[PDB]
Design a protein around this ligand. Structure first.
Ligand SMILES: [Zn+2]
Lengths: 58, 70
RNA sequence: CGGCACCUUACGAGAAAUCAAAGUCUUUGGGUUCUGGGGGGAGUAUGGUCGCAAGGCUGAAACUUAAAGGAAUUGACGGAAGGGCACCACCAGGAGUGGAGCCUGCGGCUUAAUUUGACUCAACACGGGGAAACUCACCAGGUCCAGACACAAUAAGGAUUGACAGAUUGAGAGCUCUUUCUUGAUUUUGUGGGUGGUGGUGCAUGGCCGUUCUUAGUUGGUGGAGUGAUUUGUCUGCUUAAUUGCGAUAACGAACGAGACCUUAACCUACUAAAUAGUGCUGCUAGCAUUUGCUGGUAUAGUCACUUCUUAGAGGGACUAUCGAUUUCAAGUCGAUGGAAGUUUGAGGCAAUAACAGGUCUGUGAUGCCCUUAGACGUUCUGGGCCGCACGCGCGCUACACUGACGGAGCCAGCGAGUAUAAGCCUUGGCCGAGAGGUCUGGGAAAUCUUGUGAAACUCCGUCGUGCUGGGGAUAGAGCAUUGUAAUUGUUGCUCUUCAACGAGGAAUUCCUAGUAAGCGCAAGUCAUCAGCUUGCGUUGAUUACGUCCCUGCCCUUUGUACACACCG
């Protein structure tokens, strides 16, 4: 989060504004590239074709 | 939260005393003569010629440099 | 058959609540009677009529008003019901406060001002507010323009500033008055215009903080209910510190908050290295029994070795691990063994949707506006005051004695801070001083030096021996230093001296479940001096729980409403 607070001076009073923004965590380059709780799961490599007992000479 | 009030009479700041043609009192221009320089300019090195003293009571003062003689 | 009704459903109706009729009504027609036409005035006046009367029946208008009202939704509120949680609640306990003195703040009183804000939790050792100048906003006195800039007047034959000595004044403020001196168009008068305020307005505001509440709560996408506002999801029960999960389920899958996360603390004989850390060796050296050892000094070249204890970067390790039990055999919980750690591992930081007439315009060159702005509410300067006491309240401490005082002997922590041409930092070490303090060197811009901060409690050995005693240290008198321009209304300490109440404190009420409570000291702060205060650290080190809704508080659900500026209605 980048936080910016500025006071705007009107003729009738003060307007204190706060523009609070985020860049994409995956767009971060130096710190963590996601939230702490971000759990990412890879895909399965199972469901292959298995054959009884071959032997390959290379 | 109070109204300010005075007791002494209101003062007036000192005004410079305007003298009409002050330069006349320093010299007595002699006919067919020289400059008089009667007023005995201060002998301090700070003020050279043209800067005179004040022939007052029992003191002689020049306002350029703050000194008195007799 | 007839009834008095009841349950479900909604073909259908309804604004909805609901309705077996309140259906068969814009697809408008079975018969028929009565009644209403916004709210009041008003079922009033009058007339008639009935009545013993009380009164009944019939029954206006003037005038006045933009609403009145019905059903339901959300919220708010309740001196309503049901659940849940919590040492800012209790059970069981520990220590307290409330008794005296003092310090300190609050109200009150006085004052020249005794500045003021805040007043249950969420006011009162809080405004980082321990005030001599300053702070200061207040009081008695004195200055300056440091009123920019456009103009108009004046103005070089001088717009005008500074001024010796004396008077005044506190002043060696030419501030002003006597004084005639000196610079010269920056300058003097007025207008605009400003500008500056610890002035007012936190009930005109921002920004921050506190509070609700750090409780666990909050929200939308798709689907379902509803004409809708909305609602379900977001919930009986169990579980958890927790809307956190199991589970049940017109819901399903998600997001914020919690948890995660981060800082700190623990373990690492496994790494990376450590002359600003230490150790074992190695020299050289010492004292004793001579046993070759026990203790030490030294060694920025012994040009020793190492990281193990000390530091900190990289990592690792715990995820309720495995087992016995109960549980919806789920979420979990309870007992063991291992482990360094099995209470979220310990303690903290950040911390949701909106909000409060909570606090601050006394921190701002943050402010809008009102006040004022040259005899200034601006500033500056001297002196005072916040300290002032017939009184009540609280945050603390000193203790009320022997689980103790003094007097010796022993003597361990940790967190931190510390400088130059200054405006004087930490100060050692030496030298003087009963003490406080004084003198001379030197180290350190820093793990080096200050400082192993050898802190106190504590352990021991002695006197004291129940006495207000030698427990206690108010109130007061005398000298020596320190700091500051300046200590009187004692800055403070020190030396001597005075030797107070207090002999454990009522009704009440506070904090707290483990290195925690409670004794005990130390450092950083405001600070030139002033700590009985906070902020942090370290030493010693417990009792009892490990449960509940009895009190209180909050939250949720049900319920009620004529409230929505929301009961301060
Ligand atoms: Zn001269």
């Amino acid at each position: 989060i980048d936080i910016a607070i500025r006071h705007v001076l009107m003729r009738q009073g003060v307007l204190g504004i706060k523009v609070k923004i985020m860049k994409d965590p995956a767009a971060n380059r130096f710190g963590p590239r996601a939230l702490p709780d971000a759990v990412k799961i890879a895909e399965a490599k199972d469901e292959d074709e298995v054959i009884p007992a071959p032997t390959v000479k290379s | 939260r109070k109204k300010k009030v005075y007791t002494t009479p209101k003062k007036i700041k000192h005004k410079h005393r305007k003298h009409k043609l002050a330069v006349l009192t320093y010299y007595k221009v002699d006919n067919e003569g020289n400059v008089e320089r009667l007023r005995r300019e201060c002998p301090a090195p700070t003020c050279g010629a043209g800067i005179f003293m004040a022939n007052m009571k029992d003191r002689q003062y020049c306002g350029k440099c703050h000194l008195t003689l007799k």
